Amino acid sequence: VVGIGRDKLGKIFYRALTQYLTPTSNFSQLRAAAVQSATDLYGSTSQEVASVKQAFDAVGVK
Amino acid sequence: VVGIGRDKLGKIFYRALTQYLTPTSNFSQLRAAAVQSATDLYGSTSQEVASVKQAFDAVGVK
């Protein structure tokens, strides 16, 4: 699973938008925002961060 | 009114990244990707689409 267990990504991504993201966002801004979000929500010793990272990998290159 | 609960938001963003997004992505590209994910998942005139849009809309104003 390329993002933990789909629905569980919710917390990370929502936070990544409303706290870490900008109106003038690119792909990389999202990446950092999402990793930071995961790190804060579930700790960084977690596969939850690794899963956030994994999402970015398979973007168009499925 | 993010009427789905942050946990549902995860389903969307996995699909948004891996199936709908580009390597050379931007905020506007992501808007569509997430909205479209939510459409596929929960119908078009859906609270899921409403909650997704709202996230992007808040970010875009500050």
Side-chain angles (χ1 to χ4, degrees), chain A:
Chain A
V1 187
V2 187
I4 41 178
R6 289 186 167 258
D7 57 284
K8 298 295 177 176
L9 276 187
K11 276 76 182 69
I12 300 131
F13 261 105
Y14 198 93
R15 188 179 175 117
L17 266 139
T18 55
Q19 195 193 117
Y20 300 107
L21 220 66
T22 55
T24 55
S25 279
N26 50 52
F27 180 89
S28 306
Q29 228 266 251
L30 191 65
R31 187 209 67 71
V35 190
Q36 236 296 302
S37 291
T39 304
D40 280 63
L41 288 172
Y42 301 94
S44 54
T45 42
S46 71
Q47 213 295 318
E48 282 92 302
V49 189
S51 267
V52 164
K53 286 172 172 178
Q54 285 172 230
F56 290 89
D57 209 282
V59 173
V61 265
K62 300 160 179 62

Side-chain angles (χ1 to χ4, degrees), chain B:
Chain B
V1 58
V2 283
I4 53 164
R6 284 175 66 142
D7 192 283
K8 298 299 171 62
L9 198 278
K11 270 166 175 169
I12 297 148
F13 269 105
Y14 193 141
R15 203 176 179 80
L17 275 120
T18 58
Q19 295 157 237
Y20 299 113
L21 208 71
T22 46
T24 48
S25 261
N26 47 74
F27 186 82
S28 43
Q29 219 273 256
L30 192 78
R31 298 182 68 108
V35 164
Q36 264 65 83
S37 303
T39 309
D40 286 66
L41 293 155
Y42 263 58
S44 53
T45 64
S46 192
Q47 236 310 314
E48 205 180 69
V49 187
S51 174
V52 168
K53 286 176 166 191
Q54 281 180 81
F56 291 93
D57 291 303
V59 190
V61 171
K62 293 287 183 175

